Design a protein around this ligand. Sequence first.
Ligand SMILES: Nc1nc2c(ncn2[C@@H]2O[C@H](CO)[C@@H](O)[C@H]2OP(=O)(O)O)c(=O)[nH]1
Ligand SMILES: [Ca+2]
Length: 104
Amino acid sequence: ACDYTCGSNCYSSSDVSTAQAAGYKLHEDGETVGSNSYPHKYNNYEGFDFSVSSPYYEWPILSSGDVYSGGSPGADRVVFNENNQLAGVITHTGASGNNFVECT
Ligand SMILES: Nc1nc2c(ncn2[C@@H]2O[C@H](CO)[C@@H](O)[C@H]2OP(=O)(O)O)c(=O)[nH]1
Ligand SMILES: [Ca+2]
Protein backbone atom coordinates (compact mmCIF):
# COMPACT_ATOMS: atom_id res chain seq x y z
CA ALA A 1 0.00 0.00 0.00
CA CYS A 2 1.06 3.60 -0.60
CA ASP A 3 1.86 5.97 2.24
CA TYR A 4 0.91 8.86 -0.12
CA THR A 5 -1.04 8.52 -3.37
CA CYS A 6 -0.77 11.45 -5.79
CA GLY A 7 -3.22 10.62 -8.56
CA SER A 8 -1.74 7.36 -9.86
CA ASN A 9 1.72 7.89 -8.30
CA CYS A 10 2.43 5.77 -5.23
CA TYR A 11 4.99 6.91 -2.64
CA SER A 12 6.27 5.27 0.52
CA SER A 13 7.54 7.27 3.49
CA SER A 14 11.08 6.36 2.42
CA ASP A 15 10.53 7.98 -1.02
CA VAL A 16 9.30 11.16 0.68
CA SER A 17 12.12 11.47 3.22
CA THR A 18 14.70 10.87 0.48
CA ALA A 19 13.18 13.66 -1.66
CA GLN A 20 12.83 15.98 1.34
CA ALA A 21 16.44 15.52 2.43
CA ALA A 22 17.77 16.47 -1.02
CA GLY A 23 15.49 19.53 -1.13
CA TYR A 24 16.36 20.69 2.37
CA LYS A 25 20.11 20.37 1.68
CA LEU A 26 19.86 22.65 -1.35
CA HIS A 27 17.76 25.04 0.72
CA GLU A 28 20.43 25.06 3.42
CA ASP A 29 23.17 25.80 0.88
CA GLY A 30 21.22 28.49 -0.92
CA GLU A 31 21.30 26.62 -4.22
CA THR A 32 18.54 25.72 -6.69
CA VAL A 33 18.01 23.24 -9.55
CA GLY A 34 15.92 23.44 -12.72
CA SER A 35 14.22 26.24 -14.66
CA ASN A 36 11.73 26.81 -11.82
CA SER A 37 14.50 27.09 -9.21
CA TYR A 38 13.70 24.28 -6.77
CA PRO A 39 13.47 24.26 -3.85
CA HIS A 40 11.48 27.49 -3.56
CA LYS A 41 8.94 29.06 -1.26
CA TYR A 42 5.51 27.50 -1.15
CA ASN A 43 3.00 30.29 -0.40
CA ASN A 44 0.12 27.98 0.59
CA TYR A 45 -2.49 29.90 -1.45
CA GLU A 46 -4.53 26.68 -1.15
CA GLY A 47 -4.76 27.17 2.60
CA PHE A 48 -3.88 23.62 3.52
CA ASP A 49 -3.99 23.09 7.26
CA PHE A 50 -0.34 22.06 7.74
CA SER A 51 0.48 21.00 11.29
CA VAL A 52 4.01 22.50 11.26
CA SER A 53 4.78 26.20 10.95
CA SER A 54 5.85 28.11 7.88
CA PRO A 55 7.74 29.26 5.94
CA TYR A 56 7.22 26.32 3.60
CA TYR A 57 9.33 25.23 0.63
CA GLU A 58 8.43 22.85 -2.15
CA TRP A 59 10.64 20.32 -3.91
CA PRO A 60 9.61 17.80 -6.64
CA ILE A 61 9.19 14.13 -5.79
CA LEU A 62 9.41 11.85 -8.83
CA SER A 63 7.52 8.63 -9.59
CA SER A 64 10.73 7.25 -11.12
CA GLY A 65 12.23 7.05 -7.65
CA ASP A 66 15.08 9.35 -8.69
CA VAL A 67 15.96 12.58 -6.87
CA TYR A 68 15.05 15.71 -8.84
CA SER A 69 18.02 17.15 -10.70
CA GLY A 70 16.41 19.34 -13.37
CA GLY A 71 14.12 19.09 -16.36
CA SER A 72 10.42 18.41 -15.86
CA PRO A 73 9.44 18.18 -12.14
CA GLY A 74 6.25 16.21 -12.78
CA ALA A 75 3.13 17.13 -10.80
CA ASP A 76 4.08 16.03 -7.29
CA ARG A 77 5.85 17.98 -4.53
CA VAL A 78 7.00 17.46 -0.96
CA VAL A 79 6.52 20.52 1.27
CA PHE A 80 8.96 21.02 4.18
CA ASN A 81 9.67 23.90 6.56
CA GLU A 82 12.73 25.73 7.93
CA ASN A 83 13.31 22.95 10.50
CA ASN A 84 13.19 20.24 7.85
CA GLN A 85 9.83 19.08 9.18
CA LEU A 86 7.49 17.52 6.66
CA ALA A 87 4.36 19.65 6.12
CA GLY A 88 2.77 17.51 3.41
CA VAL A 89 2.85 15.90 -0.03
CA ILE A 90 0.83 17.72 -2.70
CA THR A 91 0.06 17.43 -6.39
CA HIS A 92 -1.23 19.30 -9.47
CA THR A 93 -3.01 16.04 -10.49
CA GLY A 94 -6.77 16.43 -10.13
CA ALA A 95 -6.54 20.18 -9.48
CA SER A 96 -7.35 22.86 -12.03
CA GLY A 97 -4.60 24.95 -13.57
CA ASN A 98 -1.53 25.29 -11.39
CA ASN A 99 -3.47 24.66 -8.19
CA PHE A 100 -2.63 21.77 -5.84
CA VAL A 101 -4.57 19.16 -3.86
CA GLU A 102 -3.08 17.00 -1.12
CA CYS A 103 -1.91 13.47 -1.80
CA THR A 104 -3.93 10.88 0.08
N1 LIG B 1 -0.71 26.83 -6.73
C1 LIG B 1 0.31 27.30 -6.03
N2 LIG B 1 1.44 27.63 -6.64
C2 LIG B 1 2.38 28.15 -5.79
C3 LIG B 1 2.30 28.34 -4.45
N3 LIG B 1 3.43 28.92 -3.92
C4 LIG B 1 4.20 29.07 -4.94
N4 LIG B 1 3.63 28.64 -6.12
C5 LIG B 1 4.19 28.81 -7.48
O1 LIG B 1 3.49 30.00 -7.89
C6 LIG B 1 3.06 29.92 -9.29
C7 LIG B 1 1.49 29.75 -9.54
O2 LIG B 1 0.79 28.67 -8.91
C8 LIG B 1 3.83 28.73 -9.78
O3 LIG B 1 5.06 29.39 -10.19
C9 LIG B 1 3.94 27.75 -8.56
O4 LIG B 1 5.10 26.86 -8.76
P1 LIG B 1 5.29 25.30 -8.75
O5 LIG B 1 4.72 24.56 -9.92
O6 LIG B 1 6.78 25.24 -8.68
O7 LIG B 1 4.60 25.05 -7.49
C10 LIG B 1 1.12 27.99 -3.81
O8 LIG B 1 0.97 28.12 -2.61
N5 LIG B 1 0.15 27.46 -4.67
CA1 LIG C 1 9.12 4.09 -4.37
